[PDB]
């Protein structure tokens, strides 16, 4: 795995902007697993990411008036056959209370990798830490980091 992904400058189809209410996940408490994930409201990503690649992306997200670099996992809902999009966001390097029912605004700046077949909790923790390390290295570049002051976050 590479320690950095994407071009030096943001390229189409990024940036991709949207917002959604943070709702409860599916029971799996990631907060204790050291990797809390914010399940975005399904009614805001269905069409927008319907034809986007499943996988982990990166960029910036805002909630409770604060912007943080982030990693987003985009997959499908398992409870149904018909393709139902799902998205979960992990705000990187944040300290605070939970923000359920709060509107989160997201700016996707790039793709990291496709969804790896689930292979246990430990491996998944390892994969996500690398993801976080990659997102930071990727957004340390001017073209990407300036999006932290994007009008959408104003």
Ligand X SMILES: Cc1cc2nc3c(=O)[nH]c(=O)nc-3n(C[C@H](O)[C@H](O)[C@H](O)COP(=O)(O)O)c2cc1C
Ligand Y SMILES: Nc1ncnc2c1ncn2[C@@H]1O[C@H](COP(=O)(O)OP(=O)(O)O)[C@@H](O)[C@H]1O
* Annotated binding-site residue numbers for Zn(2+): 37
Decide: 100 and 23 in contact? Cβ < 8 Å.
Answer: yes
CB of 136 to ligand X, least distance (A): 13
Residues 135 and 72: their CA atoms lie apart, in Å, by 10
Name which of ligand X, ligand Y, none residue 36 binds, using a CB cut-off of 5 to 8 Å depending on partner kind: ligand Y
| Residue set of the binding site | 37
Binding mask 55-94 for ligand X (x = CB under 6 A): -x--------------x-x--------------x-x----
Residues 131 and 137: their CA atoms lie apart, in Å, by 10
Decide: 109 and 10 in contact? Cβ < 8 Å.
Answer: yes
47 is catalytic: no
Which three-class secondary structure state does DSSP give residue 43? helix
DSSP 8-state symbol, 63: E
Is residue 135 part of the contact set for ligand Y (CB under 6 A)? no
- Based on its alpha-carbon atoms, the radius of gyration of the chain, rounded to whole angstroms, reads 15
How many residues touch ligand X under the rule CB under 6 A: the total is 18
Which residue of 2, 8, 11, 28 would you call a contact of ligand X, by CB under 6 A? Answer: 28
Residues at the interface with ligand Y (CB under 6 A): 22, 24-25, 28-31, 36-39, 90-91, 94, 98-100
Q: Which residues are catalytic?
A: 88
């Amino acid at each position: 795995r590479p320690e950095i992904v994407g071009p030096e400058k943001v390229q189409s189809p990024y940036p991709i902007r949207f917002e959604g209410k943070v709702v409860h996940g599916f029971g799996r408490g990631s907060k204790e697993l050291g990797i809390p994930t914010a399940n975005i409201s399904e009614d805001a990503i269905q069409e927008l990411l319907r034809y986007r690649d499943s996988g982990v992306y990166f960029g910036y997200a805002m909630v409770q008036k604060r912007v943080f670099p982030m990693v987003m996992s985009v997959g499908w809902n398992p409870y149904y056959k018909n393709k139902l999009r799902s998205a979960e966001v992990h705000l990187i390097e944040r300290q605070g209370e939970d923000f359920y029912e709060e509107i989160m605004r997201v700016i996707v700046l790039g793709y990291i990798r496709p969804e790896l077949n689930y292979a246990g909790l430990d491996k998944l923790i390892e994969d996500i830490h690398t993801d976080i390390r990659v997102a930071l290295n990727s957004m340390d570049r001017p073209s990407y980091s300036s999006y932290k002051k994007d009008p959408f976050f104003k």
